[PDB]
């Protein structure tokens, strides 16, 4: 079992300083730590602690005596020796000193294997991309126009990835991490022998232990100790540095950033050595300085350089805070730090926000983390009662207006106060729109107005909320169980009290193993006030991982009942009250969100092609808002929300419970300093305790706070008589103040006028925020006439800045997920490469990088085996033949390979048929020479796998090939099944059944075993049926690492299952060895397929032979979709050129036009008019009866019936067959089912954070016209063609290029192509099989509704 | 004879005097109308004051509260 | 009949005179009430002016007093209304 | 002896005038009874707020 | 003639009724004393607020 639950490969936990200190002091390791540094650990009785844990102490003593023997000088005390013991933050400038190059062969073998494999496919990939450019533009310089400098191929990429700086460091820390993970795995199994590893490299001695490593560098005479989390963090940071430096070296776009990033890294490493853990304040100041430098180019003189100067002052304060540097040294350091950000384009100035994670993370202490929140929270705060009631009145107005525009424009049930004027009387009587200008006046009367019950909201409305695992704290009596037993044993022995019981329960497991669960009775915990009277309640903080800022270093955890009430209340707020606010543009659809943000940023840019429209953007982060929320500023809003929802006392729970309770920071190695503090309630407001908190907690009750902030923003906007559009995000907000200026004014003067108009709005907003208790400092406020910040992305002058280096920094050598398969890692690398394509990096370079890192990952997995195997035949066969490695890496993942990035994926996110794209890629590789035609013949002639009807129906477009599903998803499904099997919750009484797989197989066979097989129709019908609903509910579980471990423990895997999960990688490699080794003998009729055959025909034939066992010769219809690159034969027209396809026969094309004279980040009058580009089209029914408030079950049944009738026929027998599959989810009869069913024609057949598809730099000025074309598959095809054309236009002028001196026209002639085929459907398809006996959860509300109509 | 005429004349004159008295008394009611118009604002402002005071009292975090129904 | 036509007339008339002298006090009391209510408007304007801009501050816990002692807050939900109710 | 009839018609005329003015005076009195009721409510709510402030 | 003496007895009876309700009008004086008392109270109690 321990071979699956391997130690994590990447950092996921905070670095605890006291853990390392505990390990160092346990074995009496040499150190120069002051008594103040040790904190509470100095006064611990280490004799007893060493008496226990004797294996740990024995290992530590062994490494100590090895250190003494190797370095005799370490015995000297009082720091009179020449060797200095350094803790993690002070070893940054000496990371390159640790080499271990000798007595280390695995990294060298890995590098040699990667080079040998890459050397075989570089030219083929160059030919592939050349052919792609020739086919998509008609010219061979599509990808090389912006660079022509130097074109990096795959071999060049490998050379500059393995030969640059940090490469040796990455190899030596990868070996160290691998050895330490091996030692940890051995220790878990209880081997107890040879658990100390010594490498003893010349000038660098490293000793590896399952607990910590001891690294000594003779060149610098510095010895350091690193725990496992520290080693993971160091190797992750080194890998990120390697990726960033190599990408800067490779891409011409990021070439200027290389030297600046290197100089910044060196400067901050020296600063870290000189300072300690206080250099991460400087790192955060640099994070803010990126935006300060962005604001330095603002046209307005009054707003240019303010943030720059403030951030410089903050950096100087941080530098001179502890008197490490004098004024002149701090000034020189500041100048050196700032000189790396000057003379950079806005895109690059935002791609220096990648270096935040490049210096690791600070060593956290519970006391320091608690100090910040205790300073912010638990503080007196004076509030303005006029501001509170004005905000409440505008809250009422916004809620009323949001209830209007829906519900037939009818006012909610409201009660008018006695003071209300006659105008309010008539407006309530009339039910007209409450004008904000009207609400500003008579605010006393707008306030004090109650909105009575508006929603019949039910806590159990959403089921997915209850299925998400959340951390839950121990009761108030076991609050000391989080700390290590060794540290608290002496305290509990002195006090003569029993040791606290460790707490390991989870919220998800408590919910699932709850016999009597009901949200109606669960909310009574808060409704009846039992939470205030609960003595067991205990809320505690815990250190947050991968955090460098002082704020947000802790996240809180609460008891099971309180957490359940919190999630129920948040869901209640978001479902009904949250939807009423449309003043902010937040939507659950990312496409609409980015369109709204693009329009908001493009408000200010108006071209010459009266009074124009001008915008000034204001962005403020709300991270510190949570600690500053007070009960008195939220009581009226929450009181009105209580009245609206009908629950007498549901909200205001966080503050009321917090003022009565004492909070603490729970860290296993950070016990309270005072050994006499054995109880939480009587603790003092110091150390790790936060006595009587009066503020909020981050994330908790975020919806109410966001609505209050929206009301405040609206109030401020109306107070200054300025038009704004808010976009509050919870942790951030962006405001665009709108004003009307003269058209003839110069752009600088229009911006000045906009800033002058926005000054009053900003003053009112600051005054209102101060009134409600949120003081706005210069840190929070960034005023810019060009850009605003949303979702950590900068919207600069109608674009979105790239930040591709931030994406490339997290491209590591192994997925952190459980299975750790080669396929999962390759998929992660491909996803990161897709992000790089979207973020401005060269598409050709991205393709080469994806191939190179796929090869590198496979070589790493081959030469760094996670689990030792008795038979190494497969591994040796792959290691000795790099051509096999190349063939496997270049083969698409749909055919069994590890190439998860298709050629067409480089241009459009949406892919119709993955198999067609895979076939097109294989044909391209065969034409270039990367692969061989006999590989294609072997794939065509491959023996069908062990597939059933269920796998064909559940996941269409997939061939019958074994080992296409990684062991990771198998582990996730096993965890979900184990959770379902032991579940006893009433809400899931009938979800789980033992014959679920049999029922799914029978239904899939019924839907598929017909005259014509329709995998999409069967997939949709299965998903919308009862069994599909049960599968969805079972898949609602999160299946985290803890959940997977619990499932493996309570339900152990069989020996055969254990072995196959362990050796999935070797089994997959051996399975693909049958096709990537030698030309197999295939059937003679397969020779008709050639490299010139259309990918659609090849895909149809491959699906026919692959599923030959299941179908016995029947063809598969409804899946094929043209490959976007192969479908279109584009031509680019520059100046006097003409389209060859237009002049020769073809007359179908998608017209793309780019005007001339465009210059980004320049005068808006000069360039052609700007507009929101085409980012995509989502779902957008004419049913006989428009049922409002229809349940999910009713909609699912209606869609199932419609799809069945549309696909299998409109005969009465088909209607009876679909009646059963509809009645498995509703209680309709045939007549109501037929009447209520939507129109059964043109079935969509569609079924299954902020990542924009592009920067939209040059796609905003483009002109499109699809008039000369035919025009829901055709709509998807045309949308894909449009997106591909936009991507082609964007890559024609890469982010290195910012001007277009000539007008360009793109045609993308989709005609005269073999992939265009007529679409035929709606034929008669008799069942051919009796309808299976389907068990339906009649009593379950979330699957079946006995009353689907009112 | 003429004496009865003297009596009737004196009465009609006396009723005329009272008539002036009652029309004055009637004219007195305009400021009663004004005081009603101002007592309107009296109730309105008093209700506003009461409401402010109530929402200030509920804002104290010591005592948990709840909107009825 | 003439005596009857005069004696009761004069008696009723004197009663009218007395009631009229009683009634003219109405104008006086009414105008005094008017002025007093004008003063009520003057002072109510000030009381709103004072109540509109009021500071509400939560003292918080800067001293660090143990939470046990700071437990001077009710634990029972109480349903109070403000404007609507 | 007609003058007597003429003066008598005159007395009837001033009479009707007394009726109309006195009737509207009664209307004024009824409206002061309303005023009385409202101010009563003002006293009640003033007493309530006096209880609330202390 | 006698008809107008009868009519005038009618109008003086109505007159006595008018005086009857006129006597009822003065009843407001106690309540207006109460309203002045209200003023005194509100002044004394707004003195506390400042
Ligand atoms: Zn053309
Ligand atoms: Zn084709």
Q: Provide DSSP, A225-268.
A: EEEHHHHHHHHHHHHHHHHHHHHHHH-SSSTTHHHHHHHHHHHH
Which long-range contacts (C-beta less than 8 Å, at least 24 apart) are formed by A494-497?
A494/A675, A495/A676, A495/A678, A497/A678
Q: Is residue A1298 part of a domain?
A: yes
Position of tokens 């919870």? Answer: A730
Q: Is residue A520 part of a domain?
A: no
- Whether there are 3 or more C-beta pairs closer than 8 Å between E and A is no
User: Residue E35 is part of which domain span?
Assistant: 2-49
Chain A residues near residue C51 by CB distance under 8 angstroms: 385
Interatomic CA distance for residues A35 and A1071, integer angstroms:
60
**E33–chain C nearest CA distance, Å:** 9
The phi, psi pair for A788, rounded to 5°, reads -135, 160
| Distance from Cα C50 to the centre of ligand 2, integer Å | 81
Beta strand ranges found along A18-149 (DSSP E): 84-86
Question: Out of E28, E35, E45, whose CB is closest to D50?
Answer: E45
CB pair distance less than 8 Å for E21 and D19: no
| 3-state SS assignment for residue A618 | strand
How many angstroms is it from A140 CA to the middle of ligand 1? 18
CA-nearest residue to E16 within chain D is D22
Q: Rounded to a whole number, what is the distance in Å from the CA of B32 to chain D's nearest CA?
A: 8
Are A1021 and A1096 in a shared domain? Answer: yes
Listed in sequence order, the residues at least 6 apart from A406 whose beta carbon sits closer than 8 Å to its beta carbon are none
From ligand 1's centre to the CA of A1273, what distance in Å? 24
Q: How many CA atoms lie within 13 A of B17 on its CB side?
A: 11
Closest CA to A938 of A1102, A786, A825: A1102
Whether residue A1229 is found in the same domain as residue A1262: no
C-alpha to C-alpha distance for A1255 and A1124, rounded to whole angstroms: 21
Q: Which of B66, B68, B69 to mutate to test the interface with A (most CBs of A within 10 A)?
A: B66
A1088 domain-assigned:
yes
Q: Tell me the CB-side half-sphere exposure of residue A467, using CA atoms within 13 A.
A: 18
Q: CA-nearest residue of chain D to B37? A: D35
**Virtual CA dihedral for A628, A632, A637, A643, nearest 10 degrees?**
140
Q: Do residues A968 and A897 share a domain?
A: yes
Cβ distance of C80 and B61 shorter than 8 Å = no
A831 within domain boundaries: no
- Residue A355 in any domain: the answer is no
Which residues does a chain break follow in chain C (C to N more than 2.5 Å)?
none
Bridge partners (DSSP) of residue A382 are: C57
Please state, in angstroms and rounded to a whole number, the distance separating the CA atoms of residues A423 and A299.
45
Alpha-carbon span A541 to A688, nearest angstrom: 10
Within-domain flag for A900: yes
Of A385, A448, A632, the CB nearest to B61: A632
Other CB atoms within 10 Å distance of the CB of residue A135: 15
Q: Which ligand is nearest to the CA of A138?
A: 1
Q: Is D45 in Cβ contact with B47 (below 8 Å)?
A: yes
CA A707–ligand 2 middle distance (angstroms): 53
Query: Does one domain contain both A1063 and A1139?
Result: no
Q: What number of other Cβ atoms are within 10 A of residue A754's Cβ?
A: 25
Q: Under a CB-based contact definition with an 8 Å cutoff, are residues A1010 and A1327 in contact? A: yes
CA distances from A905 to A465, A724, A1054, A1118 (A): 34, 38, 40, 22
Instruction: List the one residue out of A579, A642, A633 whose CA is nearest residue A451.
Output: A642
Residue A327: closest CA among A313, A337, A339, A346: A313
The Å distance, Cα A1129 to ligand 1 centre, comes to 10
The residue written with tokens 């034929």 in the block is A1323
Find the helix packing angle between A122-137 and A1273-1292, rounded to 10°. Answer: 110
Residue A1060 lies in a domain: yes
Closest CA to A531 of E24, C12, B64: B64
Number of other residues whose CB lies within 10 A of the CB of residue A102 = 12
In whole angstroms, what separates CA A1096 from the centre of its chain? 34
The strand pairing partners of A543, in sequence order, are: A554
Residue A909's φ and ψ, nearest 5 degrees, are -65, -45
Q: Identify the H or E element spanning A742.
A: strand A732-742
**Are A1016 and A971 found together in one domain?**
yes
Beta bridge partners, A1285, equal none
What is the least distance, in Å, from the CA of D47 to any CA of chain B?
A: 11
- The helix (H) or strand (E) run that includes residue A1109 is helix A1108-1111
H/E segment holding residue A383 = strand A381-384
Q: Which two three-digit tokens encode residue E10?
A: 């009618």
Residue A453: closest CA among chain B residues belongs to which residue?
B69
The C-alpha atoms of residue A280 and residue A676 are separated, in whole angstroms, by 34
Alpha-carbon torsion B31, B35, B37, B41, what sign?
A: positive
What backbone phi and psi angles, to 5 degrees, belong to A490? Answer: -65, -40
Does A1154 share its domain with A1211? no
What token pair was written down for A396?
């009422």
Residue with tokens 């003569």: A496
A568 phi and psi angles, rounded to 5 deg? -65, -45
Residues with CB under 5 A from ligand 2 (ion): A 1094, 1314-1315
The dihedral sign for the CA sequence A1264, A1270, A1274, A1275: positive
Residues in B closer than 8 angstroms to D25, CB to CB, are: 22, 25-26, 29
> What 3-state class would DSSP assign to A208?
strand
Q: Are residues A1006 and A1155 in the same domain?
A: no
Domain count, chain E: 1
- Name the residue facing A656 among B48, B52, B61 (closest C-beta): B61
* Residue in the block written with tokens 């990455």: A170
- The CA-based dihedral angle spanning residues A35, A41, A42, A45, taken in that order and rounded to the nearest 10 degrees: -170
Q: Which residues of E touch C (CB under 8 A)?
A: 2, 5, 12, 15-16, 19, 22-23, 25-26, 29, 32, 35-36, 39, 42-43, 46, 49-50
Burial A514-538 (b: 16+ CB within 10 A, else e): beebebeebbbbbbebebbebeebb
D21/B16 CB distance under 8 A: no
Contact call for C and A: 3+ CB–CB distances under 8 Å: yes
Q: Which residues pair with A784 in a beta bridge?
A: A617
Q: Which residue of E has its CA nearest to C48?
A: E46
DSSP state at residue A991: T
Task: Please report residues of D whose CB lies closer than 8 A to that of B32.
Answer: 28, 31-32, 35
Those residues with Cβ within 8 angstroms of residue A482's Cβ, 6 or more apart along the chain or in another chain: A474, A502, A503, A540, A666, A667, A668
Instruction: Kindly list the distances between the CA atom of residue A1024 and the CA atoms of A878, A1194, A1246, in Å, as whole numbers in the listed order.
Output: 44, 10, 12
Q: Establish whether chain C is in contact with chain B, requiring a minimum of 3 CB pairs below 8 angstroms.
A: yes
For chain D, list residues whose CB is within 8 angstroms of any CB belonging to chain B. Answer: 7, 10-11, 14, 17-18, 21-22, 24-25, 28, 31-32, 34-35, 38-39, 41-42, 45-46, 48-49, 52-53
Q: What is the DSSP letter of C59?
A: -
CA torsion sign, A1136 to A1142 to A1147 to A1153? negative
**Within a domain: residue A810?**
no
Closest CA to A526 of A645, A706, A646, A647: A647
Chain B: residues touching A (Cβ < 8 Å): 43-45, 47-48, 51-52, 55-56, 58-61, 64-69
Side-chain half-sphere CA neighbours of A187 within 13 A: 17
Residues 6+ apart with CB under 8 A from A1259: A1173, A1174, A1286, A1289, A1290
Residue B9: beta bridge partners?
A: none
CA distances from A48 to A20, A23, A54, A56, A601 (A): 19, 15, 10, 13, 65
What is the number of domains present in chain A?
4
Choose the closest CB to D43 out of E4, E24, E34. Answer: E34
Name beta bridge partners: A207: A198, A214
Helices (H) and strands (E) in chain D, counts: 1, 0
CA distance B9 to A23: 126
Helix ranges restricted to H, A1112-1237? 1124-1127, 1140-1143, 1192-1208, 1212-1223, 1230-1236
- Among the listed residues A682, A656, A674, B62, the one whose alpha carbon sits nearest the alpha carbon of residue C64: A682
Q: Which residues of A touch B57 (CB under 8 A)?
A: none
Which parts of A468-579 fold into alpha helices (H)?
485-495, 507-512, 519-522, 524-527, 560-572
d(CA A1020, CA A1131): 39
> In the block, which residue shows the tokens 């600070």?
A362
Could you tell me the CA-to-CA distances from A1011 to A1008, A1022, A1208, A1261 in Å, in that order? 9, 19, 10, 51
Question: In terms of Cα–Cα distance, which of A403, A508, A457 is closest to A642?
Answer: A457
Structure tokens at A893: 């993942």
Identity of the residue in D19, D32, D50 whose CB atom sits nearest the CB atom of E41: D50
Structural domain that includes position A1278: 1128-1179+1248-1306
A1084 C-alpha to ligand 2 centroid (Å): 23
CA angle, residues A783, A787, A791, in degrees to nearest 5:
100
Distance CA B27, CA A659 (A): 64
**Residues A1017 and A925 reside in one and the same domain:** yes
Determination technique used: cryo-EM
Q: Sort out which chain B residues have CB atoms less than 8 A from A529's CB and list them.
A: 64
A1094 CA → ligand 1 middle, Å: 22
**C-alpha A1125 to ligand 2 mean position (Å):** 10
At what resolution in Å was this solved? 3.0
Query: How buried is A1092 (Cβ within 10 angstroms: 0-12 exposed, 13-18 middle, 19+ buried)?
Result: exposed
Strand ranges (E), A511-630: 540-543, 554-557, 611-621
Q: Give me the count of residues in chain B.
A: 69
Using an 8 Å Cβ cutoff, are A469 and A510 in contact? no
- DSSP symbol at E21: H
Interface of B with C (CB under 8 A): 4, 7, 11, 14-15, 18, 21-22, 24-25, 28, 31-32, 34-35, 38-39, 41-42, 45-46, 48-49, 51-59, 61-68
CA angle, A36 then A37 then A39, to 5°: 70
């Amino acid at each position: 079992l321990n071979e699956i639950l391997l130690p994590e490969v990447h950092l996921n936990s905070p670095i605890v300083r006291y853990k390392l200190f505990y390990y160092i002091l346990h074995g009496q390791l040499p150190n120069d730590l002051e008594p103040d540094d040790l904190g509470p650990l100095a006064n611990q009785n280490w004799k007893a602690i060493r008496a226990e844990e004797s294996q740990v102490h024995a290992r530590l003593k062994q490494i100590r005596v090895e250190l003494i023997a190797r370095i005799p000088s370490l015995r000297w005390t009082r720091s009179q020796r020449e060797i200095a013991i350094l803790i993690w933050p002070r070893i940054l400038p000496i990371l390159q000193a640790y080499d271990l190059r000798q007595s280390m062969q695995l990294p060298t073998v890995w590098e040699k294997l990667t080079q040998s494999t890459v050397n075989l496919i570089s030219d083929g990939l160059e030919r592939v991309v050349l052919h792609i450019s020739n086919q998509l533009t008609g010219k061979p310089n599509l990808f090389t126009r912006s660079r022509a400098y130097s074109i990096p191929s795959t071999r060049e990429l490998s050379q500059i990835w393995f030969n640059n700086e940090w490469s040796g460091s990455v190899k030596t820390w990868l070996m160290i991490k691998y050895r330490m993970r091996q030692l940890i795995t051995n220790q878990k199994t209880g081997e107890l022998t040879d658990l100390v590893t010594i490498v003893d490299t010349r000038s660098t001695l490293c000793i590896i232990t399952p607990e910590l490593v001891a690294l000594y560098s003779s060149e610098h005479k510095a010895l350091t100790y690193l725990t496992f989390e520290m080693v993971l963090m160091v190797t992750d940071m080194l890998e990120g540095r390697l990726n960033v430096s190599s990408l800067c070296t490779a891409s011409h776009y990021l070439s200027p950033l290389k030297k600046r990033i290197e100089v910044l890294l060196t400067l901050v490493d020296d600063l870290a050595l000189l300072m300690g853990d206080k250099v991460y304040g400087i790192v955060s100041s640099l994070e803010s300085f990126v935006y300060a430098q962005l604001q330095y180019g603002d046209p307005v003189i009054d707003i240019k350089g303010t943030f720059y100067g403030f951030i410089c002052n903050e950096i100087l304060d941080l530098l001179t805070e502890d008197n490490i540097f004098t004024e002149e040294e701090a000034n020189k350091v500041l100048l050196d730090l700032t000189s790396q950000f000057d003379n950079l384009s806005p895109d690059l100035t935002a791609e220096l926000l990648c270096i935040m994670r490049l210096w690791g993370h600070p060593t956290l202490t519970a006391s320091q983390a608690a100090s910040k929140v205790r300073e912010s929270m638990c503080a007196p705060k004076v509030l303005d009662f006029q501001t509170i009631m004005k905000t409440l009145a505008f809250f009422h107005a916004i809620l009323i207006n949001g209830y209007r525009r829906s519900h037939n424009g009818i006012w909610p049930p409201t009660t008018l106060h006695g003071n209300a004027p006659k105008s309010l009387i008539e407006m309530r009587h009339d039910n007209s729109e409450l004008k904000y200008e009207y609400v500003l006046k008579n605010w006393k009367s707008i306030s004090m107005l109650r909105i009575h019950k508006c929603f019949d909201a039910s806590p159990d409305e959403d089921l997915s909320i209850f299925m998400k695992d959340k951390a839950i704290s121990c009761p108030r009596q076991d609050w000391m169980g989080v700390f290590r037993r060794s540290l608290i044993k002496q305290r509990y022995r002195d006090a003569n009290r029993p040791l606290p019981q460790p707490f390991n329960r989870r919220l998800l497991l408590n919910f699932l193993e709850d016999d009597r669960f009901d949200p109606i009775k669960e909310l009574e915990y808060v409704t009846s006030g039992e939470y205030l009277r609960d003595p067991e309640f205990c809320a505690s903080y815990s250190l947050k991982e991968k955090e460098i800022k002082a704020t947000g270093r802790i996240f809180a955890k609460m008891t099971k009942r309180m957490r359940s009430c919190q999630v129920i209340a948040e869901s209640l707020l978001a479902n009904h009250a949250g939807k009423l606010m449309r003043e902010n543009g937040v939507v659950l659809d990312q496409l609409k969100l980015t369109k709204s943000l693009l329009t908001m940023n493009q408000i200010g840019i108006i071209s010459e092609h009266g009074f124009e429209i001008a915008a000034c953007f204001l962005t403020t982060d709300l991270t510190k808002y949570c600690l500053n929320w007070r009960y008195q500023v939220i009581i009226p809003f929450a009181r009105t929300l209580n009245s609206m929802y009908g629950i007498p006392h549901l909200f205001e729970w966080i503050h009321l419970r917090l003022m009565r309770s004492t909070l603490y920071v729970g860290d296993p190695f950070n016990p309270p300093s005072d050994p006499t503090q054995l109880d939480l309630d009587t603790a003092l407001n110091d150390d790790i305790f936060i006595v009587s908190p009066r503020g909020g907690i981050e994330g908790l009750c975020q919806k109410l706070w966001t609505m209050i902030s929206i009301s405040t923003i609206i109030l401020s906007a109306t107070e200054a008589n300025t038009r704004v559009m808010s976009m509050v995000q919870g942790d951030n907000q962006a405001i665009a103040i709108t004003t009307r200026v003269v058209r003839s004014l110069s752009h600088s003067e229009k911006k000045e006028q906009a800033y002058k108009a926005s000054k009053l709005f900003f003053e009112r907003l600051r005054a209102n925020n101060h009134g409600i208790g949120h003081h706005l400092k210069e840190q929070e406020t960034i005023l810019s006439s060009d850009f605003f910040i949303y979702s950590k992305r900068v919207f600069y002058k109608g674009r979105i800045l790239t930040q591709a280096l931030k994406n490339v920094s997290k491209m590591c050598l192994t997925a952190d997920i459980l299975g750790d398969c080669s396929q999962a890692s390759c998929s992660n690398l491909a996803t990161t490469v897709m992000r790089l394509t979207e973020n401005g990096v060269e598409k050709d370079l991205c393709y080469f990088l994806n191939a190179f890192m796929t090869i590198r990952q496979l070589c790493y997995d081959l030469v760094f085996p996670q689990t030792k195997s008795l038979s190494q035949d497969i591994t040796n066969a792959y290691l000795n033949h790099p051509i096999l490695i190349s063939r496997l890496c270049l083969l698409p993942s749909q055919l069994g390979g590890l190439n998860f990035l298709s050629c067409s994926r480089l241009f459009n996110r949406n892919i119709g048929d993955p198999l067609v794209s895979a076939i097109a890629d294989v044909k391209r590789l065969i034409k270039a020479g990367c692969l061989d035609i006999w590989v294609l013949y072997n794939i065509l002639g491959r023996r069908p796998g062990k597939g059933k009807w269920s796998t064909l129906a559940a996941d269409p477009y997939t061939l019958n090939i074994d080992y296409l599903v990684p062991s990771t998803t198998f582990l996730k499904k096993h965890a979900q099944y184990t959770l379902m099997e032991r579940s006893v919750n009433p809400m899931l009484r009938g979800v789980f059944s033992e014959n679920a797989a049999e029922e799914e197989e029978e239904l899939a066979q019924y839907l598929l075993d017909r005259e014509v097989v329709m995998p999409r129709v069967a997939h949709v019908i299965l998903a919308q049926s009862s069994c599909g609903r049960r599968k969805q509910i079972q898949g609602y579980l999160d299946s985290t690492r803890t959940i997977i471990r619990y499932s493996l423990e309570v339900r152990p895997l069989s020996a055969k299952k254990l072995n196959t999960v362990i050796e999935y990688n070797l089994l997959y490699l051996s399975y693909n060895l049958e096709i990537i080794e030698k030309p197999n003998i295939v059937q003679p009729f397969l020779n008709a397929i050639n490299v010139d055959t259309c990918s659609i025909d090849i895909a149809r034939s491959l699906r026919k032979l692959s599923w030959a066992t299941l179908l016995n010769g029947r063809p598969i219809e409804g899946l094929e979709t043209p490959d976007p690159i192969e479908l279109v034969h584009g031509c680019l027209i520059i100046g006097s050129d003409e389209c060859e396809h237009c002049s020769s026969g073809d007359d179908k094309f998608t017209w793309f036009f780019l005007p001339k004279g465009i210059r980004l980040d320049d005068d808006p009058a000069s360039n052609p008019p700007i507009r929101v580009p085409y980012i995509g089209s989502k779902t957008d029914v004419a049913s006989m009866a428009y049922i409002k408030g229809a349940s999910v079950s009713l909609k699912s049944a209606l869609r199932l019936a419609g799809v069945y009738i549309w696909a299998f026929g409109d005969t009465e027998e088909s209607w009876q067959d679909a009646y059963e599959l509809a009645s498995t989810r509703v209680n309709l009869t045939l007549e109501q089912l037929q009447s209520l069913t939507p129109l059964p024609t043109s079935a969509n057949l569609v079924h299954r954070k902020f990542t924009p598809a592009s920067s939209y730099a040059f796609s905003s000025f483009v002109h499109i016209s699809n008039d000369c074309q035919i025009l829901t598959d055709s709509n998807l095809i045309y949308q894909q063609v449009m997106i591909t054309g936009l991507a082609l236009i964007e890559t024609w002028n890469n982010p290195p290029i910012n001007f277009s001196v000539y007008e360009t026209t793109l045609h993308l002639h989709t005609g005269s192509s073999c992939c265009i085929r007529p679409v035929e459907s709606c034929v008669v398809n008799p069942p051919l099989l009796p309808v299976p006996l389907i068990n339906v959860p009649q009593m379950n509300k979330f699957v079946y509704d006995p009353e689907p109509l009112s | 004879a003429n004496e009865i005429m003297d009596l009737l004349r004196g009465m009609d004159a006396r009723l005329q005097h009272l008539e002036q008295k009652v029309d004055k008394v009637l004219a007195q009611g305009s400021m009663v109308t004004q005081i009603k118009n101002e007592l309107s604002t009296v109730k309105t402002t008093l209700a506003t004051i009461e409401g402010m005071m109530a929402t200030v009292k509920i804002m104290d975090p010591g005592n948990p509260t709840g909107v009825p129904v």
